[PDB]
Amino acid sequence: TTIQVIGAGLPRTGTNSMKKALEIIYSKPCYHMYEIIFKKQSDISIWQQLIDETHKTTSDKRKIYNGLNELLNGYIATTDLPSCSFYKELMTMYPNAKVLLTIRDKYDWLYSLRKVVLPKSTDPWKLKIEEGDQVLGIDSNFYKMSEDSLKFAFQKNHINLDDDEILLECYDEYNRLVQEIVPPERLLIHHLGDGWESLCQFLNVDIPNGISYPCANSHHQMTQLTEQLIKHKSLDDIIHMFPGLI
Ligand SMILES: Nc1ncnc2c1ncn2[C@@H]1O[C@H](COP(=O)(O)O)[C@@H](OP(=O)(O)O)[C@H]1O
Ligand SMILES: CCN(CC)CCNc1ccc(CO)c2sc3ccccc3c(=O)c12
């Protein structure tokens, strides 16, 4: 098993649905931030080391390739942060892998991002998200790795993450840069709602018969997840309320 598809889309662009769609197509696992959170929190420090490497005057690209290869062993595809920030390195490692860019309206994206993964520091909802996440074992080391991967994707050392104007411009620039860097023949831009047809044609497979394209990980469900984690203090006690997520 080797990487066949590199997902370059940012969080809140349908990455979890795309992860599930690729798992349906290939019958093998796809990487996602939820793999780290729910299955392999030991990966956090490894990702942090690779992101740290990118800051050096000369990044040891072979150290990065080797670390990515180890992290992705057993997976057929990648989506989401932190992996999407390494899409160029993955393209070099896997010259036959195709690239997907999941994308959506930038204002819809910003609202989703602020509600679920990156609230403003002045938003009281941030404390609720953090309290729920603590139930999952998430701590400051996870948030540092995730923020660092986002800053790496946006190519910035210093960025005011609390400024919506900055985030909107970074989102547009990131998506533009993917389209400039990946040759069009190697890239599929998949807009929220596009479903199976373009994806299956791009990957040389048939449309899965009787299986609908996934629609996972809505902000409504995520807000409920935070609320129920806070209320019950146990993932296992609430997982029956959240089918089709992990
Ligand atoms: N098949 C589909 N059709 C429409 N929206 C979808 C979808 N699959 C996922 N989404 C939306 O993609 C976002 C989740 O992305 P990610 O998995 O990258 O975090 C959520 O947006 P909202 O927060 O606006 O509901 C979710 O509703
Ligand atoms: C109930 C919600 N909880 C658990 C699911 C959110 C857990 N947190 C995250 C989950 C998924 C993703 C990307 O998919 C990110 S990305 C990011 C990027 C920058 C800073 C933080 C984050 C971040 O904290 C996060």
* 150 C-beta closer than 6 A to ligand 2: yes
Residue 35 marked ligand-binding? no
User: What separation in angstroms does the CA of 179 have from each of 34, 86, 199?
Assistant: 26, 15, 17
Atom number in ligand 2 closest to CA 81: 13
Give the number of whichever ligand sits closest to the CA of residue 102: 1
* 225 C-beta closer than 6 A to ligand 2: yes
The bridge status of strand 77-78 relative to strand 5-7 is parallel
The C-alpha atoms of residue 103 and residue 122 are separated, in whole angstroms, by 27
Residue 227 marked ligand-binding? no
* 242 C-beta closer than 6 A to ligand 2: no
Q: Is the dihedral of CA 217, 222, 224, 227 positive or negative?
A: positive
Atom number in ligand 1 closest to CA 11: 18
Give the number of whichever ligand sits closest to the CA of residue 13: 1
The C-alpha atoms of residue 118 and residue 42 are separated, in whole angstroms, by 22
Backbone conformation region of residue 119, classed left if phi is above 0, alpha if psi is from -120 to 50, else beta: beta
- HSE of 175, CA atoms in CB hemisphere, 13 A: 20
Given resolution (angstroms):
1.4
* 14 C-beta closer than 6 A to ligand 1: yes
The C-alpha atoms of residue 166 and residue 154 are separated, in whole angstroms, by 10
User: Residues with Cβ < 8 Å from 17, sequence gap 6 or more?
Assistant: 213, 214, 215, 216, 217
Would you list the DSSP string of 38-80? HH-TTHHHHHHHHHHHTTSSS--HHHHHHHHHHHTTT-SEE-S
User: Which residue ranges form the domains of the chain, and what is each CATH number?
Assistant: 1-246 (3.40.50.300)
Element containing residue 102 per DSSP (H, E): strand 98-103
Amino acid residing at 228: Q
Atom number in ligand 2 closest to CA 80: 14
Spacing, Cα 193 to ligand 1 middle (Å): 9
The C-alpha atoms of residue 50 and residue 65 are separated, in whole angstroms, by 9
The C-alpha atoms of residue 97 and residue 89 are separated, in whole angstroms, by 12
User: Residues with Cβ < 8 Å from 8, sequence gap 6 or more?
Assistant: 84, 87, 99, 100, 101, 178, 182
User: What separation in angstroms does the CA of 13 have from each of 50, 189, 204?
Assistant: 24, 11, 23
CB count in 10 Å sphere of residue 157: 8
User: What separation in angstroms does the CA of 26 have from each of 2, 5, 16, 208?
Assistant: 11, 10, 15, 11
Residue 139 marked ligand-binding? yes
User: Residues with Cβ < 8 Å from 191, sequence gap 6 or more?
Assistant: 102, 103, 104
Give the number of whichever ligand sits closest to the CA of residue 154: 2
Cα 69–chain centre separation = 17
Q: Return the percent helix, strand and coil in the chain, to nearest 5.
A: 55, 5, 40
Tell which one of 36, 117, 134 to mutate to probe ligand 2, the residue whose CB is within 8 A of the most ligand atoms: 117
User: Which tokens go with 163?
Assistant: 């400024």
Atom number in ligand 2 closest to CA 225: 1
